[PDB]
């Protein structure tokens, strides 16, 4: 995986030696080249993962998250270069360096063969994200949002550190490839109950679990646009990736440890979706919708059936692209009206028709319109949860009502109705902005042609 | 009740508005024109019966039970004009009513398609920006202390001045753009 | 009563400015100044070329794979002659005539 | 479809509806014939005149505007402003 680590590190002298007008173009160009190179990871096999070395390996779970991670960096550079135009040159290079460092930490988070190196990268991703939120966020509450984002995560993750070192001392290894073959069943005891909580609660915070999600409608809201893109599209998915790696070791106790948390998501996705019906802040609506979508991934990983893991990894990739595009649309209106209040700028289809078409497409992917991979992941999770217990379709189907009802309300409040009279700085859609919307939406639509690459290791 | 110029409705205004609402709901009940015309003259006679009532408590009481009469005898789906609020074509063309300032955001290759129109728009914008300071100082020299009392605006008192706060009334979009 | 003299004066002045604005929304005879820029081809490009493409696709890529175009077998009656065999299907038994 | 209204056409139609009203003699009526002062009509008659204007032109005049149109020229000017004639 060193053929992706070294170009990502060479992005640092590429941005610190570029000319002062050239640091966006060069980083965008070569991060798109790294994203083009990322497709070589699709050398996957039906039985064996692509096992590079003692340190790095990539199965069909890590591979779509790697492609999405390496694709998200140029899109974040395009999204973030407008509001940092008057920024100091060295602080601009520090911002780009934090994004590059975050990509570097993520692409060897997903390919970490051994789990304590997974933990070190998984918690190394906090520091650039924390710095981006608390340094280039816009409002006063970015500092409190950074504190919440840091301290839910560490309070979750330090028992994970203790539990992973315990697995190291007991099983002798934390290689995932070794632990595929040396995994011992985990019986019913209180020691194994807190073993399960220590192995799971960090990823429960990072998904986020409902009830532990409180960091997110601050951290996703107070961040700048590149911070919201990487938090929604990649950094929530570290929790689901780590759950799919760690629930190998947690059988068969998971079959009765999952019961509270499944409830916490199956009711919680009803609640947060309902919360999206009454959000006045558009960016907070997208944050609570991210919680609502990741609750299904939490249920699908806890019920641990093949259809559930396939729908969970499809829904993770699909939600990455969809929520990243939704935050970019919300920023494209924030760069004009300078307020995140959704009721302020109305009737924008009269003023920006092509941008309203992008709003329509991202809303339809948010509400899981078939045959998008949003609907593929949504549908496979609903199939597996119906096979889990037949009553859950109620909480699924009711969810799919409310998920429509905030997605089109977001489409109706912002784009439809009479336009606001006193707002007159509504510029036409820049080419950078429409390029950003298309570079989100067009891969999300092309993946419906060949969805088998985003369906995990057990397609 | 709720009016821009007046703080209230007078009793006479309440009687007139009840009369018009009663005739519209009667026309909704009495579809054909001759039959409506007969019952409308009968309702006009009912309003002419208590026209010269001088006891204002008695007139207010009669207006109140006439409102209760109307509320019992209203049509469930009254006739609404198509562009009236509640109509079928009400606020239909609001998606086509693009404001004028968006013409400022046009590219010069699509402004060159209409040379005379934008050359004529420039003198409208110039007239507005030279009238603006005169009409602000007209508003501040005429508004009483404590702010304005009603939402009415004064007219242009001098020759050469334009009325204050005139741009978004004159340059509003058409009803059929 | 109706309007005050101030309201009549303001509505007259706003009306004059509005009619000037609506008149000035008209067009010039040169405007819009534009920049300087086979009988049954619809039956060829939209129909016949798709019949060619779809017939090639179904003949050499779809029917070459099993169970892709599965047709219901044709209906067989007493008194028929099979094309692939020549076997005459024997006709029905004589009817107990009802009318 | 949708023929454009003019000031002369609206004036003709408003005076035409008022010449078909049996409480106004059609020889005394002009464009400035005030209904309460010159024509001597009731406020109920003014309400019925505005309702006949609504039935004539097909759009509702609100009561805050109906209680102030006191001559036929005011009615023609109001219909002109609410329909944007002489474009």
């Amino acid at each position: 995986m060193l053929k992706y680590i070294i170009p990502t590190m060479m992005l640092m002298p590429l941005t610190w030696l570029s000319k002062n007008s050239m640091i966006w173009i060069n980083t965008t160009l070569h991060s798109l080249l790294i994203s083009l190179t990322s497709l070589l990871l699709l050398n996957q096999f039906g039985d064996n993962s692509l096992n590079f070395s003692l340190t790095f390996f990539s199965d069909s779970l890590s591979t779509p998250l790697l492609i999405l991670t390496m694709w998200l960096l140029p899109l974040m550079l395009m999204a973030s270069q407008h509001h940092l135009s008057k920024e100091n040159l060295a602080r601009k290079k520090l911002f780009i360096s934090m994004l590059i460092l975050l990509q570097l930490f993520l692409i060897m988070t997903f390919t970490a063969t051994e789990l304590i190196f997974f933990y070190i990268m998984f918690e190394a991703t906090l520091v650039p994200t924390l710095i981006i939120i608390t340094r280039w966020g816009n409002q006063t509450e970015r500092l409190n949002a950074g504190l919440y984002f840091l301290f839910y995560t560490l309070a979750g993750s330090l028992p994970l550190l203790v539990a992973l070192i315990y697995i190291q001392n007991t099983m002798g290894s934390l290689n995932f490839l070794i632990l595929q073959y040396w995994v011992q069943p985990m019986p019913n005891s209180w020691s194994n109950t807190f073993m399960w909580l220590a192995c799971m609660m960090a990823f429960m915070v990072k998904m986020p679990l409902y009830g532990l999600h409180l960091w997110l409608p601050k951290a996703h809201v107070e961040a700048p646009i590149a911070g919201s893109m990487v938090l929604a599209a990649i950094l929530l998915k570290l929790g689901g990736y780590g759950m799919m790696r760690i629930t190998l070791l947690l059988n068969p106790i998971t079959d009765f440890m999952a019961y509270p948390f499944i409830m916490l998501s199956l009711w919680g996705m009803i609640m947060t979706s309902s919360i999206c019906l009454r959000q006045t802040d558009l960016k907070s609506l997208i944050a609570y919708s991210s919680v609502s979508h990741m609750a299904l991934v939490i249920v699908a990983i806890l019920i641990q059936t093949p259809w559930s893991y396939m729908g969970a990894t499809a829904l993770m990739i699909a939600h990455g692209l969809t929520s990243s595009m939704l935050f970019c649309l919300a920023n494209s209106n924030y760069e004009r009206v300078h307020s995140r209040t959704m009721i302020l700028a109305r009737g924008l289809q009269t003023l920006l028709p092509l941008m309203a078409a992008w709003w329509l497409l991202a809303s339809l992917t948010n509400l899981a319109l078939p045959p998008s991979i949003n609907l593929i992941g949504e549908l496979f999770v609903v199939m597996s949860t119906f096979s889990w217990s037949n009553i859950t379709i109620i909480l699924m189907g009711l969810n799919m009502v409310i998920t429509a009802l905030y997605s089109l309300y977001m489409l109706i409040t912002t784009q439809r109705g009479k336009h606001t009279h006193h707002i007159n700085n509504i510029l036409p859609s820049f080419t950078r902005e429409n390029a950003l919307m298309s570079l989100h939406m067009l891969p999300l639509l092309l993946l419906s042609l060949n969805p088998k690459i985003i369906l995990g290791p057990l397609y | 009740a709720f009016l821009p110029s007046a703080a209230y409705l007078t009793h006479q205004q309440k009687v007139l508005q009840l009369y018009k609402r009663a005739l519209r709901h009667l026309e909704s009940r009495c579809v054909h024109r001759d039959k409506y015309r007969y019952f409308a003259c009968l309702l006009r006679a009912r309003f002419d019966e208590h026209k010269n009532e001088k006891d204002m408590v008695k007139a207010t009481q009669l207006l109140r039970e006439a409102e209760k009469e109307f509320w019992h005898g209203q049509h469930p789906q009254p006739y609404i004009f198509p562009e009236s609020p509640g109509g079928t074509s009400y606020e239909r063309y609001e998606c086509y009513k693009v404001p004028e300032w968006c013409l400022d955001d046009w590219h010069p290759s699509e402004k060159a398609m209409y040379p005379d129109y934008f050359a004529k728009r420039e003198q409208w914008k110039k007239l507005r920006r030279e009238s603006w300071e005169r009409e602000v100082k007209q508003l501040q020299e005429e508004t009483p202390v404590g702010g304005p009392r009603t939402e009415a605006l004064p007219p242009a008192r001098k020759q050469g001045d334009l009325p204050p706060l005139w741009w978004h009334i004159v340059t509003r979009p058409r009803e059929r753009p | 009563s109706g309007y005050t003299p101030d309201e009549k004066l303001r509505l007259q002045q706003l009306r004059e400015l509005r009619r000037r604005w609506l008149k000035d929304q008209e067009l010039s005879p040169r405007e819009p100044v534009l920049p300087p820029r086979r009988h049954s081809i619809f039956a060829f490009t939209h129909v016949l070329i798709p019949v060619w493409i779809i017939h090639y696709y179904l003949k050499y890529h779809v029917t070459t794979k099993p169970y892709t175009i599965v047709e219901k077998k044709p209906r067989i009656f007493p008194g028929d002659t099979i094309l692939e065999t020549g076997e005459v299907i024997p006709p029905m038994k004589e009817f107990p005539d009802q009318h | 479809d949708a023929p454009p209204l003019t000031l002369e056409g609206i004036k003709d139609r408003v005076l035409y509806v008022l010449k078909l009203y049996d409480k106004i003699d059609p020889e005394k009526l002009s464009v400035n014939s005030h209904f309460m002062k010159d024509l001597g009509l009731d406020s109920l008659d003014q309400v019925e005149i505005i309702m006949a204007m609504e039935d004539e032109f097909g759009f509702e005049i609100p009561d805050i505007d109906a209680e102030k149109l006191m001559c036929p020229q005011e009615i023609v000017d109001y219909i002109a402003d609410k329909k944007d004639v002489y474009e």
Partner: peptide, 13 residues
């Protein structure tokens, strides 16, 4: 004759 201008947003971009 009597052609009216249609105020629309900028369709250039």
């Amino acid at each position: 004759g009597k052609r009216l201008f249609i105020i629309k947003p900028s369709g250039f971009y």
